[PDB]
Design a protein around this ligand. Structure first.
Ligand code: QDM
Ligand code: QDM
Ligand code: SAH
Ligand code: SAH
Lengths: 240, 239
């Protein structure tokens, strides 16, 4: 049971989230508009935990420079193939140092939840502040806050494309300060038969004030906007 | 063991999810029986499984009994049909010491036999348990000409807090279908569990079924369509 977005799990990622109705084109359009509201001259964007680089692909149409940081080599390989021109980095949002600063540092789809507690979140936000330009914005899509988390939640969905049928079932429970989300897959095709895969993640249920404390310790002013890309809302931060 | 444990426990929910209507099939079956035997009063369901047909057939026939090889399936059937006599046994060699107006074998259970000889044997046993005015009914598996290798079935159903996803894959293995079936079973407390079964279901030709019926002294007819699109064979003694 893996926790590192690798192997076959990485290969299924885009198909499954497409099946669940995720619309990266609309999300990118909205994000780019939000960046330009806070920074009308923005010409550059770093997407941290870029995964398979789906947002970056669309954001390349709005900004002259897009870069990405991704911990998982297998996700990153997909991201690079999708963004063959972009400079994408293999590393860790807790401790990274790129060549430059950007008008927007973004961290989407609750990837920030993969951090383990307040020290790590603080560290990541300090790094984001370190890579943002003075008239820029830091954008973090949080995981659920403890008060909005729904333990016992089961998601199931099946999709097919290109001869491959993929079923994904998730189960979520409370494990201390985090969601434990277990995810099983059945992957079927006419000649390959059926294979079973599993993943299991601890995604931290930070409170709003814990997010805010992280932005604040980084020198960033912080604003929460409810709703956002997944019903989890959006944090925006501005330097100095 | 085939059809055992958690697989047996999931059987009814997954086939309900797939739209299988045992109430309508039982009514159609009862009508077919009574067309051939208007005073029909008894029925034996061979390979009765969880006893879903029998539950409904008991409202049409004064006596219903069943034969089932799997203990875990049989336990379910008994709980569903607590007034009925259900036997633990094998369609290839059983002997109940009585006869019935109908002997039925539904949902391609006959595919669990291998070879002409086992098929002949079963049909002889069915003839040995049918009344002389009655009828043997067997739902075949697919004929070779209609089998679709590489077939993938996937569906998800939820009942009572439990979400079950079933995915089957089918290929050719000699003169049979190899069907492998994976389940993901999920619930708020239970989490997710994975289960798997795998079966060989023999691709008997139409002529093979007819040979089995004729050797058991039954006059045979194939009725196309049937409960599953695979038709139904009927057989009447005294040929
Ligand atoms: C609607 C609603 C949902 N939830 C929770 C329950 C459950 O944990 C989740 C819905 O399950 P899903 O299987 O639909 O979760 P998902 O597609 O959002 O995947 C989640 O986990 C993946 C493993 C991660 O890769 C992913 N991010 C980090 C990329 C993460 O967002 O959202 C709540 O806690 N409160 C709610 O009001
Ligand atoms: C429509 C069509 C289907 N098929 C085949 C392909 C595949 O093997 C099957 C459809 O898949 P499914 O997973 O829908 O099969 P099913 O719910 O009917 O389960 C079958 O297998 C189960 C393991 C058995 O327990 C069961 N009987 C013996 C009780 C048997 O009927 O039917 C064909 O070969 N040709 C066809 O034209
Ligand atoms: N410490 C860390 N630094 C960088 N990336 C991380 C990380 N911990 C987890 N990740 C990455 O977080 C990503 C979560 S999946 C989200 C991917 C992408 N933002 C999207 O919207 O589709 C994964 O690719 C995972 O490898
Ligand atoms: N040799 C044999 N004798 C009796 N039952 C058998 C058999 N081989 C397989 N079976 C039974 O055949 C059944 C197939 S499942 C079909 C069950 C039922 N007739 C229904 O329509 O739902 C299983 O319960 C299996 O255990």
């Amino acid at each position: 049971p893996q926790a590192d977005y690798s192997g076959e799990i990485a290969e299924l990622y885009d198909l499954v989230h497409q099946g669940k109705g995720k619309d990266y084109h609309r999300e990118a359009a909205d994000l780019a508009a939000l960046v330009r509201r806070h920074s009308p001259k923005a010409a550059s964007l770093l997407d941290v935990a870029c995964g398979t680089g789906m947002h970056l692909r669309h954001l390349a149409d709005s900004f002259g420079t897009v870069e990405g940081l991704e911990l998982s080599a297998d996700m990153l390989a997909i991201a690079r193939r999708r963004n063959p021109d972009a400079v994408l980095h293999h590393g860790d949002m807790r401790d990274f140092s790129l060549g430059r600063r950007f008008s927007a540092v973004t961290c989407m789809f609750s990837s920030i939840g993969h951090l383990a507690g307040q020290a790590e979140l603080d560290a990541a936000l300090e790094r984001f502040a370190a890579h943002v330009l003075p008239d820029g914005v830091v954008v973090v899509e949080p995981w659920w806050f403890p008060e909005n988390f729904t333990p016992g939640y089961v998601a199931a969905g099946t999709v097919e494309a290109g001869g491959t049928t993929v079923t994904r079932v998730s189960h979520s429970s409370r494990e201390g300060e985090a969601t434990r989300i277990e995810v099983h897959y059945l992957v079927a095709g006419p000649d390959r038969g059926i294979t079973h895969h599993e993943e299991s993640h601890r995604i931290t249920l930070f409170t709003r004030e814990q997010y805010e404390r992280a932005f604040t310790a980084a020198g960033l002013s912080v604003e929460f906007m409810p709703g956002g890309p997944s019903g989890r809302g959006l944090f925006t931060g501005l330097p100095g």
